């Protein structure tokens, strides 16, 4: 059968499937686009966050004021009005950072001496990395022993005294403090990553080159996350006074790109960092996507008329190569972020190259701009700044303005009109055609780089709306008291600025996200007004209505099963019906207990809200249900010292007898005790560490807690509607060793879930690990941007 | 023509050739060895 009809069809189908899979793999290996998750920046002026950068760009403002008077510069003989005297600069102004002199060595594991030895560049890079990691939404403490690449772009320069002469207290740390490799080695060591760490020095085009490398390791597959950035800062006026010898610096210090009055390029300083991930991986895990990088190209200009002389053919070739790698055409680009350094000779060459590379096949004019007009030349910090500007403009749907462009140059020809200089803001709305942009960077060494950036896919739309009645806790942590106070003040301020936010979104973002730190605060407000009230109360200093407490290197909790003493319970049908964990575990144990003890689950767990024969089995049942829900809520137990019925409860929890079997044995105990009236576990009646198997039929306060504390467990948690013997334990807390805290579960008739919210808030208040995804799970809460960590900086300088 | 093994055979052969070429390209793009042509050094002890 199947003669020549079915036999070959199956093989043909299999071969076609294999060919399709192989070609798909080829395409993925060659041209997989990458996605930008988050960005971080530090620019001259008051700019410290990308929002301020976009606000400055939209309002059209420059950030050039003068020179710094903090870094011990002479400032005086720096310009004898004769240009050619030794030690005479030419720039009477510029754009410089005002925060480089300050640092916070306490937050990191850094000693004041070696902190004084640390270069400002890596000093800024550490903060940039931490801020971008928090902005992405990934807890910075989760990235441990994982493949994550770091790529940095710097220029060595100099900071302090020479190594030969040494210092008085800081001698051994001089070498590591000033070295380009340590700039990324320190980041890798602090964050505990394991991917490649690379520092690249390729002049003003360094930063872009870095991201190019970050776009390759991700594509090949040697790393699953990349952090690429650049930095430039000046602790010495040497660069200006040496560049003035070439007479290439404009006096005032501005960039008049494509203007009739070009005089120089000026200098500045800054820092930028981006986080990159494969698009499929990022979308699989739900990480945010801001823009997509598709193709990059790096080239050299070859032999020219000197090292500083630029080339046009190389730029054209690199642009065409980037376009070919991206697999697009010259007509798919709407705007370009040209270099626009503002020099006399560079501008015509770059303009001609861009013309010949883009505008020959163009129906619509191409917009051109340069960020160096607003901020000046930032050396290696540039390149990434252009990328940030382009992505911000594309997201906001507006093209910003370029300054000092009202007087177009006279050495270039614009007869074709294919390139229109950006002098006024231009709307950039969404449409059928996706938006794309290109960024160029050229270095004085002779290396050129080009990149193409595209908008994120418009698939986020389609979110639904769901409501609920469960209130969720709010938590916030920091490493110092003032840090906690400032964080609370900033959160209250931001919540004041932006109204309409649901409590669920803020609760979820302040959930998994910010890391776990010594100083913690937690609460649970009904609405936002009382939330602001308690937040301002925390900001003032007196913590009332919330929970606080330091906890250094504490990660364990202890479950203790108290005996009788929580009587009258306060029947909670809401616990049984609202919580499904009860409605499963307690239901199972109850129907296990039903056949033996004639009493049903209907009669008194129906409750008349308005006898050891009955209570003890039901207290055991509700105890095991509560223990199950607690352990499912992320908090695991430890050795249990449960007394009386607590012995059977601990037997059930630690694995001595099964739920049905433990229920049956407690029913037998109740039936034999209703006549006379009228996993590591810690033994109670003997006081020893025992295995969970010896507990049998034959088996049926001070020294115990001393030994448990001496072991290393310093907290006690009892599952009871009313905490009993708490003071007895509490009095012991100061009596020996470290202090002891006991957390209640319920209150006097307060069976509402809000009581459990307070219990959880008190649990997190003192060194207890809680699985927040488990307690949130399904609520529809989505990520929401929040302010980053506020620091406490101090002056750290070392004069030469 | 003859039964039906006059058109399916050629298509199967072409598919096999294409699959072999694609897999060869993948292998070459992944693990192509790199041949070293020449070397130069300048080391202590008079080594040049």
């Amino acid at each position, epitope marked *: *059968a*199947s003669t020549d*009809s*079915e*036999k070959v*069809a*199956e*093989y043909l189908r*299999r*071969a076609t*499937l*294999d060919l399709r*899979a*192989a070609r798909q793999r080829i395409r993925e290996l060659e041209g997989e686009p990458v996605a930008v998750v988050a960005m971080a920046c530090r620019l001259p002026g008051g700019v410290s966050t990308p929002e301020e950068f976009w606000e400055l760009l939209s309002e059209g403002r420059d950030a050039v004021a003068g020179l710094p008077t903090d870094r011990g510069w002479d400032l005086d003989s720096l310009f004898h009005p004769d240009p050619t005297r030794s030690g005479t600069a030419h720039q009477r102004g510029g754009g410089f950072l005002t925060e480089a002199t300050a640092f916070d060595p306490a937050f990191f594991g850094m000693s004041p001496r070696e902190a004084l030895a640390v270069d400002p560049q890596q000093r800024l890079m550490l903060e940039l990395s931490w801020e971008v990691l928090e902005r992405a939404g990934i807890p910075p403490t989760s990235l441990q022993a994982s493949p994550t690449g770091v790529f940095v772009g710097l220029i060595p320069q100099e900071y302090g005294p020479r190594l030969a002469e040494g210092g008085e207290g800081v001698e051994g740390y001089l070498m590591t403090g000033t070295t380009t490799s340590v700039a990324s080695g320190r980041i890798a060591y602090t964050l505990g990553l394991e991917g490649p760490a690379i520092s690249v020095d390729t002049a003003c085009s360094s930063s872009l080159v870095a991201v190019h490398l970050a776009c390759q390791s991700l594509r090949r597959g040697e790393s699953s996350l990349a952090m690429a950035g650049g930095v430039t800062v000046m602790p010495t006026p040497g660069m200006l006074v040496d560049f003035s010898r070439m007479n290439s610096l404009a006096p005032d210090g501005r960039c008049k790109a494509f203007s009739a009055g070009a005089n120089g390029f000026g200098m500045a300083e800054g820092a930028g960092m981006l986080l990159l991930e494969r698009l499929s991986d990022a979308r699989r895990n739900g990480h945010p996507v801001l823009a997509v990088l598709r193709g990059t190209a790096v080239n050299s200009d070859g032999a020219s008329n000197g090292l500083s002389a630029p080339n046009g053919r190389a730029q054209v070739r690199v642009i065409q190569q980037a376009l070919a790698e991206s697999g697009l055409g010259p007509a798919d680009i709407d705007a370009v972020e040209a270099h626009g350094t503002g020099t006399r000779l560079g501008d015509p060459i770059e303009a001609r190259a861009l013309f010949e590379a883009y505008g020959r096949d163009r129906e619509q004019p191409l917009h051109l701009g340069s960020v160096k007009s607003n901020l000046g030349h930032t050396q290696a910090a540039a390149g990434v700044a252009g990328v940030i500007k382009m992505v911000l403009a594309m997201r906001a749907g507006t093209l910003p303005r370029t300054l000092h462009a009202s007087e177009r140059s006279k050495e270039i020809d614009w007869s074709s009109g294919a390139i229109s200089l950006l002098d006024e803001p231009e709307p950039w709305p969404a449409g059928a055609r996706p938006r794309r942009a290109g960024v160029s960077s050229f270095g004085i060494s002779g290396t050129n780089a080009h990149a193409i950036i595209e908008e994120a896919p418009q698939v986020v739309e389609g979110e639904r709306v769901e409501a609920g009645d469960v209130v969720a806790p709010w938590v916030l942590s920091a490493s110092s008291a003032e840090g906690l106070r400032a964080q609370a003040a900033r959160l209250a301020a931001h919540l004041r600025e932006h109204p309409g936010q649901d409590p669920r979104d803020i609760a979820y973002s302040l959930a998994t996200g910010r890391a776990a730190l010594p100083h913690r605060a937690a609460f649970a407000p009904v609405d936002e007004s009382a939330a602001l009230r308690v937040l301002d109360g925390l900001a003032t200093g007196n913590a009332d209505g919330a929970a606080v407490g330091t906890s250094r290197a504490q990660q364990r909790a202890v479950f203790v099963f108290p005996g009788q003493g929580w009587q009258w319970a306060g029947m909670a049908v809401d616990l049984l019906d609202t919580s499904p964990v009860f409605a499963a575990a307690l239901r199972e144990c109850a129907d296990a207990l039903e056949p033996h003890l004639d009493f049903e689950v209907i009669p008194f767990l129906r409750a008349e809200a308005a006898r050891v024969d009955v209570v003890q089995p039901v207290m055991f049942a509700v105890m095991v249900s509560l223990a199950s829900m607690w352990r499912a809520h992320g908090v695991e137990p430890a050795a249990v010292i449960g007394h009386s019925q607590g012995e059977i409860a601990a037997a059930c929890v630690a694995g001595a007898l099964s739920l049905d079997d433990a229920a049956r044995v407690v029913a037998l105990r109740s039936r034999v005790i209703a006549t006379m009236p009228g996993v590591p576990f810690f033994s109670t009646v003997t006081g020893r560490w025992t295995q969970p198997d010896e507990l049998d039929a034959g088996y049926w306060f001070a020294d115990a807690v001393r030994a448990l504390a001496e072991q290393g467990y310093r907290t006690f948690l009892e599952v009871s509607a009313h905490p009993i013997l708490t003071a007895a334990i509490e009095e012991i807390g100061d009596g020996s060793g470290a202090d002891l805290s006991a957390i209640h579960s319920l209150r006097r008739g307060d069976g509402s879930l809000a009581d459990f919210g307070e219990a959880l808030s008190r649990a997190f208040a003192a060194g207890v690990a809680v699985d927040w995804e488990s307690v949130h799970l399904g609520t529809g809460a989505r990520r929401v941007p929040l302010p980053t960590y506020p620091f406490q900086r101090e002056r750290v300088w070392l004069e030469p | 023509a003859s039964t039906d*093994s006059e058109k399916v*055979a050629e298509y*199967l052969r072409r598919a*096999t050739l294409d*699959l072999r070429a694609a897999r060869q390209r993948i292998r070459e793009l992944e693990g192509e060895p790199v041949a070293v042509v020449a070397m130069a050094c300048r080391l202590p002890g008079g080594v040049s």
Partner: antibody, heavy 118, light 114 residues
Framework: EVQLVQSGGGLVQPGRSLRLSCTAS????????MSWVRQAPGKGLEWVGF??????????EYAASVKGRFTISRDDSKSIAYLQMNSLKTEDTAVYYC?????????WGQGTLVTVSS | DVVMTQSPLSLPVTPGEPASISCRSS???????????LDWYLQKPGQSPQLLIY???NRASGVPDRFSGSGSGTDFTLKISRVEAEDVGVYYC??????????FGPGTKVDIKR
């Protein structure tokens, strides 16, 4: 993907019927004539029977032994394959796999248990 | 009739150095069109069967490489260049000249050399 996910099974006394369902998904079920194979505990895999595609007629073939008590259904609307039992015996206790091809045994299912005893 | 295919029974292996299994036949399996109607199957311990090589020498997608089939229409062979610890189980030769294939045959076995 191209999951199969079989269903059915259990324990039945000798002389009884049962239904086994194979749920094709993730691919076009139009012309992918499937088959049923049986693996006894302690021995190798022995073929039970395949059902052709509707393009070539939708006929079926069986291999002796189980010829008179085994029937195959080809519900195209839900892309479901059915194996129907008839008067089972004790020696038929085996794990049943639902394949994908008729001559080239492609992606396999997960198997059932079905034991006959008393 | 049939070709009564057979294999060299059990073969213990060790991690590292390669291994191979031959497969003989009585009637040539080379079809007139110019192809060999043979394939190989692998059954893992306590798991569903799997397909490795079809039509003489062709690796199916998803196979973790390291497997190579070869041979003329009478003396087929399947060789593994690198032997790991998870590729242990039962291996079956299979033909396609006769459509009413009743059984997969005995099949060879592999284990850890000791």
């Amino acid at each position: 993907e191209v999951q199969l996910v079989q269903s059915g099974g259990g324990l039945v006394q000798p002389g009884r019927s049962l239904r086994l369902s194979c749920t094709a998904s993730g691919f076009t079920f139009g012309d992918y004539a499937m088959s049923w194979v049986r693996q006894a505990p302690g021995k190798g895999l022995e073929w039970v029977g395949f059902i052709r595609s509707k393009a070539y007629g939708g006929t079926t073939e069986y291999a002796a032994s189980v010829k008179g008590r085994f029937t195959i259904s080809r519900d195209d609307s839900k892309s479901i394959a059915y194996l129907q039992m008839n008067s089972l015996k004790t020696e038929d206790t085996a794990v049943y796999y639902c394949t994908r091809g008729g001559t080239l045994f492609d992606y396999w299912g997960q198997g059932t248990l079905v034991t006959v005893s008393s | 009739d049939v070709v009564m295919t057979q294999s060299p029974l059990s073969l213990p292996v060790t991690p590292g150095e390669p291994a191979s299994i031959s497969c003989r036949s009585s009637q040539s399996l080379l079809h007139s069109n110019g192809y060999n109607y043979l394939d190989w199957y692998l059954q893992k311990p306590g798991q569903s069967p799997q397909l490795l090589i079809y039509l003489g020498s062709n690796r199916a997608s998803g196979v973790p490489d390291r497997f190579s089939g070869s041979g003329s229409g009478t003396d087929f062979t399947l060789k593994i260049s690198r032997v790991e610890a998870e590729d242990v189980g039962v291996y079956y030769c299979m033909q396609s000249l006769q459509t009413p294939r009743l059984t997969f045959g005995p099949g060879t076995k592999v284990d850890i050399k000791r």
